[PDB]
Amino acid sequence: IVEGSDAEIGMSPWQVMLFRKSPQELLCGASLISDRWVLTAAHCLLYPPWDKNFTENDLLVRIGKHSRTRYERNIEKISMLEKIYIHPRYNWRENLDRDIALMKLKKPVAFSDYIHPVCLPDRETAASLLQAGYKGRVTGWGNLKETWTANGQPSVLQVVNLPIVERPVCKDSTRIRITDNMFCAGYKPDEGKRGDACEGDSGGPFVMKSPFNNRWYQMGIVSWGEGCDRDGKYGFYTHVFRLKKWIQKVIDQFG
Amino acid sequence: EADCGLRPLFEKKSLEDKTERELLESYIDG
Numbered sequence: 518i519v520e521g522s523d524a525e526i527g528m529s530p531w532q533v534m535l536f537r538k539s540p541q542e543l544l545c546g547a548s549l550i551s552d553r554w555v556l557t558a559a560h561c562l563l564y565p566p567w568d569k570n571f572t573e574n575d576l577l578v579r580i581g582k583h584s585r586t587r588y589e590r591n592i593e594k595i596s597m598l599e600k601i602y603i604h605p606r607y608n609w610r611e612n613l614d615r616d617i618a619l620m621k622l623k624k625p626v627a628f629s630d631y632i633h634p635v636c637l638p639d640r641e642t643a644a645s646l647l648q649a650g651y652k653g654r655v656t657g658w659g660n661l662k663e664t665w666t667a668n669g670q671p672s673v674l675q676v677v678n679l680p681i682v683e684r685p686v687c688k689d690s691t692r693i694r695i696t697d698n699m700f701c702a703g704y705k706p707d708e709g710k711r712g713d714a715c716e717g718d719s720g721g722p723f724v725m726k727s728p729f730n731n732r733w734y735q736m737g738i739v740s741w742g743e744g745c746d747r748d749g750k751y752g753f754y755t756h757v758f759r760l761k762k763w764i765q766k767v768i769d770q771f772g
Numbered sequence: 773e774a775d776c777g778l779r780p781l782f783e784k785k786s787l788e789d790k791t792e793r794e795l796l797e798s799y800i801d802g
């Protein structure tokens with residue numbers, strides 16, 4: 518996370534971390550939505566142009582971690598995937614349209630002071646909150662800068678509060694055809710403020726606190742961007758609500 | 773499942789994180 522600060526303890530209890538089995542390498546971020554369902558971005562699991570075609574047995578997840586370095590027994594947990602469900606109409610070919618994927622844990626997880634599920638939006642919360650100007654939260658353990666060097670990989674969770682950008686400014690920043698299933702966020706050149714999700718932050722949760730019930734909802738999923746924290750460019754996130762239909766059809770048929 | 777969004781060490785213990793006032797204040801103006 519670029520321009521992010523270290524998180525407080527238990528500040529994002531839904532934050533899930535996608536690791537590969539062999540090698541033990543961090544692939545992506547993700548979010549906890551139920552006691553056994555995890556939400557990530559589809560390209561984190563399937564992206565052919567880079568030979569990415571993961572199965573259940575290829576990777577694992579870690580939950581409740583604060584300090585990426587020292588392992589914390591009891592509070593954190595590791596989990597195996599029973600199945601992976603990628604949106605059938607996820608269009609990696611053109612633009613990562615419908616960039617989303619769900620993962621079912623082999624055994625459900627128990628909630629604590631540090632493992633707690635994020636909420637998913639309704640029509641009203643999504644239509645009220647996802648508006649240009651309002652600020653949402655992004656979390657991850659990604660590269661602190663676009664290009665790492667010798668001294669880049671954070672010790673604890675990193676977090677930014679990034680404002681939403683109008684659809685026209687978004688689709689003017691980049692050459693990619695942005696769809697109704699994605700929105701973009703970030704500051705602006707003449708706004709004197711920076712921040713962006715970066716490498717390894719993909720698939721993580723973009724969240725906002727609802728002024729109607731003081732609850733945290735996941736409005737987006739860290740999808741893509743031109744580098745990291747670039748002037749005139751913005752971070753693009755999967756409009757979590759639009760595809761929530763799909764999120765039902767799987768969880769309410771493979772529950 | 774019905775306690776979503778409510779963090780145990782914040783919203784449930786009646787505490788704010790160091791930056792959520794930004795998100796709340798972005799709803800008015802500043």
Ligand SMILES: NC(=O)CSCCCNC(=O)[C@H](CCNC(=O)c1ccc(Cl)s1)NC(=O)Cc1ccccc1
Nearest residue numbers: 560564612613714715716719739740741742744752753
């Ligand atoms: N390919 C397409 O034409 C559609 S757009 C993807 C264009 C190529 N991507 C990049 O340059 C960045 C480089 C590092 N920046 C970030 O990680 C983010 C910044 C902001 C946010 Cl939000 S994520 N990587 C990604 O975006 C993740 C990704 C996307 C696609 C496949 C594999 C990985």
Ligand SMILES: *[C@@H]1O[C@H](CO)[C@@H](O)[C@H](O)[C@H]1NC(C)=O
Nearest residue numbers: 563564565568569570571572
């Ligand atoms: C990987 O995607 C490919 C296309 O390269 C397809 O053959 C295959 O079904 C996927 N792999 C699986 C399901 O193991």
